[PDB]
Design brief:
This is part of a larger assembly, with 2 copies of chain A (139 residues) and 7 copies of chain B. Chain A is built from 4 helices and 3 strands; from the N terminus they run αβαβαβα. Chain A is an alpha+beta fold and 139 residues long. The longest helix of chain B is centred in the first third of the chain and has 30 residues. The chains are: A alpha+beta (139), B alpha/beta (239). Chain B: This is Major head protein.
């Protein structure tokens, strides 16, 4: 605790160079609410540089993970699901090359794991880690 | 001693074994007859030494004056093996005439030939990329044996694992055509069993003919028949 | 083995019935004997219930 | 027959402007043989401007259809399947926006329908139609 | 704990036959089920006359089962089906709980008893008549000698 | 230690039926006692009879 | 070598903290309901992880 | 039934609950919910289980 | 006059035992009985305690 690698090694592994080769650090973008009143291009842009959210016991809003997995749910037509995959990859949002890392929430089988760009994740992650470490030290 | 009336304990076991052996042997014989009829177009007649009796081994391509189609598929070659089976499907279709009522286009073959043809570059994309299973009519109907079925382009491959087929011999023939495959049983070789309707496979208990033992005599008279032998298309597979 | 019950052939109506038997592979072995007699009933109802 | 719309209306519908809105004219790129000794970029390039093949009763090698559907088979890791989707969309091979058109061969459920580019399909289709019509007329 | 040679008669010496061999490196990219199917075909070629068998099973341990199944070539196939409750053994027994997998004609079966060394599986056909036989001999008394 | 398998092969008929073990590693302990008598059968709860 | 399995009994905190490690987080997330005999044989009676 | 974040929602369709009343309580805690039956109101059924 | 292999059981392959051999040519030279004596010692060693 108190920035004893809780924000120095954790963020280093979050950015890393082998966290892409291994699993972990995955953000799920399911359907329903994620599509209400949004275009495909708008949703694809929002997916990039999208930090974490609640219910994450590890780090809550722990910066931008290197892997975002979008899956197919019941209130999601295959046009919407395959719409994001084509829209995202257009703006440089390439897919994970490891076939074992393409998994969903057990059920809702169709799930694609998309790897973010380095510029969209590592700078922001480092800046947030530095700010959090400074704030913890100033206490 | 004909204890089929007071069959208390041992009758239903020794008797069951005896008939389960005799009919097993007769079934082996009958399977040999059927496979000889379908593969070689002839009645299975042999001597003790294994020399064919020409008086009884009547061919089927001469008894009716019809000729089987012939073909050859080389799996190593680049031509799609099912393209060849597509053409020779029609050749059998045309010869059917105006009473065509076939159920399926069986291309019964061996395990090695099955694997070789399904592993062809053109075929694997459909065998691996589909083979829905539990949808082929044969697989649903049988559902009680281990045999591979692949119904591609009308052609319905069926791997035969009974060991009666030599490798590189695929025998394409329609299934369900009425009065195309016929079989006949005949009575025994007794004066009592002459001018009597055949009762299947016979079995007798001979006691008084000898003294050193008592003999059980089993006698089966059987012969298959392929009348419309112009629809079977023997093939040759090189792998 | 194929041949012992191999009716096959075609014989001939009237005589020469094939009495197929013998020439069957058959080896007799001794069944190993294993006792688990190691026991000593104290009362056990003498295992007589 | 004899070029009586068999190559004038058929090719017009093959290129069309509503054949994308409707279904039909779909080429399946399954696995196994399609991946033997090929890179992801090489396979993606080969998928573009890939004419039809045998077993097509309609037109055999009937030019380049506007829709190519790649699906997931048993001898295909999810890295390979999602590899093509990201590689293809990079070189302008966008996905169909109709969710009803994302279907496979019944089984092997994961299937994505990719719409080709207009330049890669319509010019070649028109040229092939013109050549076929000329050859049929010269007979 | 030493074997009695006067009673431990070998099997593929008493008849005059020999077993087959195999090698399945699940780390390599070659499909394990390709080798399994090849050995299945080689076994089928060695039956000949009757050649009627219920199923083709491969008896493996949990480690071997999971290593073969988790192969990249077999994963998707296992994830989609995993038996799909459409296996001969699963429909015949329906009560015993063990992993099964039918693929390319061979039925992977998981043996959880500790009797099998890791990295050792044994292919063999089920249903072949009189391929496996066993018998109970009488007691060692003079009253149960020549008695059922 | 290192494996326990009873019911070995053993010779048939007249032979040694080993009903005891000689070379072993045995220990003796006293098994603790624990009564829970805390109760009071009411005159109605004597339907056991 | 007669062991059926190799169990590592732990608590909820230990289990949830040992499997959320980066090298095993993905493997846990992408797991199957046919884990072993434990989830199969002892299922529908004890709700454990 | 919806078991999210340990919380296990359970919809009650028996009509005994007024809307806007969710009653969170642990399940399986020993001797937390107890019930008692009593004898009748007869002289024969007094001092009787 | 063809052997019935189901009854003709070689003794060596039956008892799990092997037999001895020899090789002598008496036309050239030397005393052949040396090989016979060596075989005698081998046999009596095989009998051993008898």
């Amino acid at each position: 605790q108190y920035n004893a690698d809780a924000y120095r090694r954790k963020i280093e592994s979050i950015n890393s160079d082998a966290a892409l080769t291994n699993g972990a650090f995955n953000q799920f973008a399911y359907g329903s609410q994620m599509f209400e009143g949004k275009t495909l291009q708008e949703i694809a842009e929002s997916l990039k540089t999208m930090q974490v959210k609640d219910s994450s016991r590890e780090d809550e809003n722990g910066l931008i993970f290197p892997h975002v997995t979008l899956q197919l749910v019941s209130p999601t037509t295959p046009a919407q699901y395959y719409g994001l995959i084509a829209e995202a990859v257009k703006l440089g949002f390439e897919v994970c090359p490891d076939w074992r890392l393409h998994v969903g929430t057990g059920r809702n089988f169709p799930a694609c794991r998309l790897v973010r760009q380095a510029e969209w994740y590592k700078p922001h992650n480092e800046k947030l880690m530095a700010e959090r470490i400074a704030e913890a030290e100033k206490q | 001693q004909y204890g089929t009336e007071s069959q208390t304990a041992s009758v239903e076991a020794l008797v069951q074994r005896k008939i389960e052996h005799i009919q097993r042997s007769h079934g082996i014989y009958i399977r040999d007859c059927q496979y000889t009829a379908l593969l070689k177009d002839k009645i299975l007649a042999e001597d003790e030494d294994g020399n064919e009796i020409t008086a009884l081994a009547k061919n089927f391509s001469t008894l009716w004056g019809v000729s089987r189609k012939t073909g050859a598929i080389n799996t190593t070659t680049a031509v799609n093996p099912f393209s060849v089976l597509a053409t020779k499907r029609q050749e059998i279709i045309d010869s059917m005439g105006e009473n065509n009522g076939f159920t399926s286009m069986v291309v019964l073959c061996t395990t090695r030939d099955f694997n070789a043809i399904v592993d062809h570059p053109d075929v694997r994309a459909a065998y691996e990329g589909r083979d829905g299973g539990a949808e082929y009519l044969t697989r649903r109907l049988g559902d009680a044996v281990d045999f591979q079925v692949f119904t591609h382009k009308g052609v319905t491959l069926v791997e035969d694992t009974s060991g009666k087929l030599t490798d590189g011999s695929a025998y394409m023939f329609p299934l369900g055509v009425q009065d195309m495959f016929q079989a006949v049983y005949a009575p025994a070789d007794s004066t009592d069993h002459v001018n009597t309707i055949s009762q299947g496979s016979y079995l007798f208990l001979n006691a008084g003919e000898n003294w050193r033992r008592d003999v059980i005599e089993s006698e089966v008279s059987y012969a298959c028949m392929v009348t419309r032998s112009e629809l079977i298309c023997d093939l040759t597979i090189t792998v | 083995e194929k041949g012992v019950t191999k009716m096959n052939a075609m014989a001939r109506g009237g005589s020469r019935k094939y009495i197929g038997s013998e020439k069957a592979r058959k080896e007799i072995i001794e069944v190993p004997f294993a006792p688990l007699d190691g026991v000593t009933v104290a009362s056990e109802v003498e295992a007589f219930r």
